[PDB]
Amino acid sequence: MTSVFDRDDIQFQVVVNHEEQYSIWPEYKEIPQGWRAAGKSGLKKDCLAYIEEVWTDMRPLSLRQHMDKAAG
Numbered sequence: 001m002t003s004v005f006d007r008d009d010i011q012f013q014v015v016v017n018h019e020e021q022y023s024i025w026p027e028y029k030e031i032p033q034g035w036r037a038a039g040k041s042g043l044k045k046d047c048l049a050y051i052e053e054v055w056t057d058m059r060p061l062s063l064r065q066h067m068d069k070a071a072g
Helices: 044-053 061-068
Strands: 012-017 022-026 035-042
Touching: 012 044, 022 035, 022 044, 035 044, 044 061
Parallel strands: none
Antiparallel strands: 012 022, 012 035
């Protein structure tokens, strides 16, 4: 057996600009000065779903991306 161990999970995070716009950024990269991390960090699909909401309390309108494929 090999000891490499397959763990190909590339994580991202949601970043917000001073214009309160929501974008995605890889976890492994430093954020450009002027933005900050917000929401949840995780897979790209997590980030996609999040921005769709973009916050949600009444209804996750990411449901409209279920018409596309799977909200991710």
